[PDB]
Write an enzyme that holds these catalytic residues in place. Structure first.
Site, mmCIF file in Angstrom:
data_model
loop_
_atom_site.group_PDB
_atom_site.id
_atom_site.type_symbol
_atom_site.label_atom_id
_atom_site.label_comp_id
_atom_site.label_asym_id
_atom_site.label_seq_id
_atom_site.Cartn_x
_atom_site.Cartn_y
_atom_site.Cartn_z
ATOM 1 N N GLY A 123 67.957 -20.517 -31.390
ATOM 2 C CA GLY A 123 66.995 -19.554 -30.904
ATOM 3 C C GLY A 123 67.258 -19.028 -29.517
ATOM 4 N N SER A 124 66.237 -18.384 -28.958
ATOM 5 C CA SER A 124 66.323 -17.683 -27.681
ATOM 6 C C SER A 124 66.438 -18.578 -26.452
ATOM 7 C CB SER A 124 65.142 -16.732 -27.549
ATOM 8 O OG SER A 124 65.128 -15.842 -28.655
ATOM 9 N N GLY A 131 60.545 -23.275 -31.782
ATOM 10 C CA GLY A 131 59.809 -23.126 -30.540
ATOM 11 C C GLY A 131 59.492 -24.420 -29.808
ATOM 12 N N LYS A 183 64.227 -10.392 -40.020
ATOM 13 C CA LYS A 183 63.155 -11.105 -40.718
ATOM 14 C C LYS A 183 62.100 -10.194 -41.366
ATOM 15 C CE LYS A 183 63.715 -15.083 -37.678
ATOM 16 N NZ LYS A 183 63.060 -16.082 -36.787
ATOM 17 N N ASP A 215 69.820 -16.065 -32.387
ATOM 18 C CA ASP A 215 68.698 -15.148 -32.276
ATOM 19 C C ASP A 215 68.941 -14.268 -31.077
ATOM 20 O OD1 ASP A 215 67.299 -16.249 -34.366
ATOM 21 O OD2 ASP A 215 65.721 -17.130 -33.128
ATOM 22 N N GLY A 232 64.637 -26.033 -33.389
ATOM 23 C CA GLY A 232 64.723 -27.074 -32.373
ATOM 24 C C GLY A 232 66.117 -27.495 -31.914
#
Lengths: 245, 245, 245, 245, 245
Positions: free
Chosen positions: D209-210, D127, D55, D7, D188
């Site tokens: 992710g970030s 997240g 997205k 991401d 995760g």
């Protein structure tokens, strides 16, 4: 140890039971099922030398004292008779004559003993020729005994609570490794194999009913049960006794 | 009879308790509440001639041997400390030091006695200054005792089952006309009238808490409680003792 | 038998543990709780010669291979870390390094063993300083072991079904007369008396947590726990080890 | 096989992802979460040579056609954006641009594929830094695949019914031994061990992710994930990469 | 593979069974249904050279020792007899003679094996001439076997828990790629097509009942079933064997 008690209704049957080696006889009389007429008890009493037992309705204190006065050797406070007192069993501690009572589990066993029972039996399921309940009850009481014998001492008070058992009975059980009284299988014991199976399950002996006298040859059938109960690990002999009714 | 036992936290409080007429002291220390520090217990033991008690968590066998070894006179296996065992209480029979236990009803009381308790007390509701739970427990236990004392003997095995009480203990209660151990009121006892009321309800005596020493004049207040518990039908004295805290 | 394992966060703590007589150390380091940074675990491995354990998330196969590759002596597949797999635990049979696992009852224990576990501990209630749960689990596992050791062989298949246990593990328990692995108490063990208590309930030893190092004198405290756990019937000793906090 | 998609929110991050060896980048923008502003997509497009994804809200047909017109390489029809159509997903069969969709089980996987999905991922729990749901979803989809591959042919129609899956997808799965499309773990995945664990569970690769850019050194952290994913059975190397954040 | 076992009540029927190519005979003989009279079983043993089976009541340990002592080749611990023990089956591991047992699913199968069973059959719905239940059970056991053979090794402990299966039996199934014992269809198998069908569903053979001898030509019928079961994909043959009733 490993005796057979036999239900009899007259002199003839009683003699057949003693001759076949029964250790005792039980004299028997929606109708009301009460204590047997004195003359039936005394007719059976006069026929044999082995102990004579007879039944009273649960809670029926005076029936018991009558049987006692008549000179029976043992009293079955019997659920198969019509209960006289659905809440309170006879205070058997007050009697000189000994009592046998039914049970289905250790809690019940312990309570009957706290009441003064001298002997126990399974309740089983009489009149069905089916041992499944006799098996259930002996299994349950014996498995619970084994648990008690081996459990931490300090866990007994809670165990008694959960079982609804008097703790002093559990403590006595743990001390002895077994019940302080003998425990016979009863209800549905039909075949030599049934009789030996109860002994295998941990019974001290066996009660049998009037099915023995439904036979072509009560003598031989009675003998077969007595021998199968005595020699309960002789599968060769048991296999033999299972033949020809 | 009509003794007062007081919660104390140091030597100074213990001396006040003793000088005031207490029959014993109880030495005391999401937080876990454990056995007191040995130094606090010895400090109190050194301060007085009267018996010194201390508390252990419920089921905490080793905390109880520690206290036994430190020489305490009595152990309270106490529900105010964080329980160590939620299922099994200490097997108090195995100890030489006597134990006091709490109860709310006759079943509970009989189970504690069967475990070896030498003394009982109500559970009450400590810390509130509210006697309502102590009154409930003392009422319940004593009412159930009066029932057992007077009931038909042949009904006690059923009664024991209903209460979850060991029948032997019920049989002793009936025999003695009362509990085989003394039963003190405990929890919320605040005023001279409170202490006398617990006696009126059938307590053998009273445990009181630290409130005495939050008082303006703890000596006077302690004497008040002692005198009212002893002379618990002396309303004119109890009235006098109530004036001026 | 009577070992103490100590939770340590660095080299200093690890040496204190070894020197006080710990049999092993558990190297440790609301967000997600994952396997510790290797650095922390390497630092502990270099500090001591006694076995070193670390934790992985339940079902985290790769975390376990990482600790294995780092050379830890034992892996705790730990429920206090955030589970990685909520259905399937690590197939510990596939590993050369041994695992310890938590449990609350015999069925849970038995499944962990069947996955490959080499050691067990109670789940307890970590972080609380409260042994109530550790007590429950030890009490429960041992009571069930006692029952299993002493029960009819032919009742074990049904028992395994009821417990959710693999029957082979139950047959192995009966054969040995105890668990085929050691079982430590873990969670809330705080004082010398607690440590001793656990052993009294039949633990093989005790895991203890970081509270030791919150102490004014961690060395004296660590040692007191080591002595209590090993001399767990030495009541007079235990009582002395309780003083001087 | 075993790629890592990352991401990114800008040019800088995109370059860091390509330089670390990511196989693709995902360009990212109770508020409403919609398709990203064109200029963010084209800023990321101009920064790298590896495929750029972005997205759209579930069911948002026109958002997708916008992304397509802008020349993205791949479209995630994303549950993490605010759904535009809670009953009907985009008919992806109608698009020239390929789509990835989320799933938690084989029924869902098969439906997305029947709609024209070219690629699948687990939904996981974005997240949280917690892989437990990513694990659950990969476990479920793969266990169900294994069931389908090996089940009687004639049981597939009923299986599809029970799963709520198109039967022709199940038949194609059984023919190929796997999904007809790749399936990446997502949600995760934080540590090198997490990334290798997904590969161990049967993933084709991994989305991250970030969190990579929350790091002291995104470069090194990104590299560590890419290498752990590639070399997912090198527990020695993985053990190394888990150090120093 | 493709064996037929035939239920027979006498010597004549037993010879018809042997001569038509049965691989074994089940010697047989609302009230209580107990082990057959030995006489009947001896009569069958003397009639044939192929293995002879007989039945005992579930949990009837002594009945099983009796048949063992009589020299039967196989014991069916049979649910169509009146169970003697409703909790505990026979510990068949203690016997030299092999047992067959009924089952409906893999968890039931697995428990029977763990008790000692050497052979299995579907419970089916005996007496009805209806294969629907036999089909259900064979379908269910095999579907679960297929699933178990092909599932992740580390998912077997959870699977055993869910099935109520001993995990060792499940690991053994995965290892072999099928049950460690043979599994016959039993209940309602009436026609050549039924017998063939069962084999198509993956049975190892077929038990058939007394309907054969209700036939106008039991020899032709017995033979037709033997041929159908062994040549179970010979559709043209099966079709011919269906004519001439």
């Amino acid at each position: 140890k490993g005796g057979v008690i036999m239900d009899v209704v007259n002199a003839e049957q009683a003699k057949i039971a003693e001759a076949a080696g029964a250790v005792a006889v039980m004299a028997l009389e929606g109708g009301v099922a009460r204590m047997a007429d004195p003359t039936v008890i005394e007719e059976v009493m006069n026929a044999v030398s082995i102990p004579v037992m007879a039944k009273v309705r649960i809670g029926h204190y005076v029936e018991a004292r009558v049987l006692e006065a008549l000179g029976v050797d043992y009293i079955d406070e019997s659920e198969v008779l019509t209960p006289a007192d659905e809440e309170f069993h006879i205070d058997k501690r007050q009697f000189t004559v000994p009592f046998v009572c039914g049970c289905r589990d250790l809690g019940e066993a312990a309570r009957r003993i706290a009441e003064g029972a001298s002997m126990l039996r399974t309740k089983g399921e009489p009149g069905t020729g089916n041992i499944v309940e006799a098996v259930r009850h002996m299994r349950k009481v014996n498995a619970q005994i084994r648990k008690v014998v081996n459990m931490s001492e300090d866990e007994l008070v809670a165990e008694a609570k959960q079982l609804g058992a008097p703790v002093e009975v559990l403590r006595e059980i743990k001390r002895l490794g077994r019940l302080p009284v003998v425990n016979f299988a009863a209800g549905g014991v039909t075949t030599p194999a049934d009789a030996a199976l109860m002994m295998h399950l941990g019974a001290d002996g066996v009660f049998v009913g009037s099915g023995i006298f439904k036979s072509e040859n009560p003598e031989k059938y009675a003998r077969a049960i007595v021998e199968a109960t005595t020699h309960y690990e002789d599968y060769e002999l048991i296999a033999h006794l299972s033949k020809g009714l």
